[PDB]
Design a protein around this ligand. Sequence first.
Ligand SMILES: O=c1[nH]cnc2cc(F)ccc12
Ligand SMILES: O=c1[nH]cnc2cc(F)ccc12
Ligand SMILES: [Cl-]
Ligand SMILES: [Mg+2]
Ligand SMILES: [Mg+2]
Ligand SMILES: [Mg+2]
Ligand SMILES: [Mg+2]
Lengths: 194, 194
Amino acid sequence: KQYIISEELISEGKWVKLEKTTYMDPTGKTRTWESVKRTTRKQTADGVAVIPVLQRTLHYECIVLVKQFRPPMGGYCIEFPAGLIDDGETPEAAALRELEEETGYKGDIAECSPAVCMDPGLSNCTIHIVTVTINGDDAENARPKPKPGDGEFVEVISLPKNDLLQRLDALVAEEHLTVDARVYSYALALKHAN
Amino acid sequence: KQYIISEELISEGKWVKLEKTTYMDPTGKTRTWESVKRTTRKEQTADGVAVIPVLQRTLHYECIVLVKQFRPPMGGYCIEFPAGLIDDGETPEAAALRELEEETGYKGDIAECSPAVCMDPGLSNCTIHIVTVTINGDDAENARPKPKPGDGEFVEVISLPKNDLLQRLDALVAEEHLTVDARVYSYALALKHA
Ligand SMILES: O=c1[nH]cnc2cc(F)ccc12
Ligand SMILES: O=c1[nH]cnc2cc(F)ccc12
Ligand SMILES: [Cl-]
Ligand SMILES: [Mg+2]
Ligand SMILES: [Mg+2]
Ligand SMILES: [Mg+2]
Ligand SMILES: [Mg+2]
């Protein structure tokens, strides 16, 4: 019933562009929307986010998260390990690569979402959410070696799965961080499943 | 270590602007970033709210109430938590209850309110409160609920059982061209993982 008529480039950076979108509302009235897109999509999605489940015998299961300075936020954020999918990279392969670069952990794919939208009122940006298990007991995950690309500075924070939401709330109240909306959504559902 | 040095406006729309962010990296070196922000954030603790609406009725499984809308930036229909921007002077809780009634017809009860969480912190400074709300589906107020949609708002209500949310979203993605929101998908994954 609704569809795009035209897109007008407003401003194109190296990484991000601003468009005015003309679309038909369901009444047959023509309307405009200010929209953001990345310049980097070629891919099933722009990015991957990894839900990394660190499994060590006789330990609580942990979710592995990363803490980074985010220039748009002007502060530190707690997030699932994540990055843009390389030209000709599979979402699964991008997930294991990003997980290893950001955490040093070597993981196994459990499941992979279809492309899901990040902020569909603002942007066309999409990701694959890739569930990965990490055998914390294997030699390769003993002293995990993180491989940061140029300009990437990442701290690893592993939090117990069974208490994730209370642990995230404590970090926010203590360390003045911003928790990622997908991390918080996952944490909430772990509590609401009961 | 890291902080913002300057924010240079590149392009300002009515709703969305693009900025050149100069920040200090932790090596002590000056770097830049292309950052998106909204034009609409005054004193609000966040841009917006997203509502996790748990529809509770005697001798029914709990449902998660979702909305389906055309999203110009995506060029298609999206399944999301009910959501909108926080009005100047409005609490996150009032915005959540108001957006839920406007988009679904349901009159909710506040359960929980997150801190401000980041929508896509590599791209934008955009934040929301995630507000958990219960809906007493047994109350006559919530019997034949009519969406009161705003000018240019066209919303379909989709209520899915919490106990089968991920499978029901997967069946919707199979049967038509539609994107699930990353927060809905993250919430549905955690319900499975718990
Ligand atoms: O043009 C828009 N772009 C992004 N977000 C919006 C949010 C609104 F509420 C109205 C218009 C826009
Ligand atoms: O300046 C940037 N803005 C948004 N996203 C990015 C993603 C990159 F991988 C590198 C730079 C940027
Ligand atoms: Cl798992
Ligand atoms: Mg990353
Ligand atoms: Mg990277
Ligand atoms: Mg809305
Ligand atoms: Mg609305």
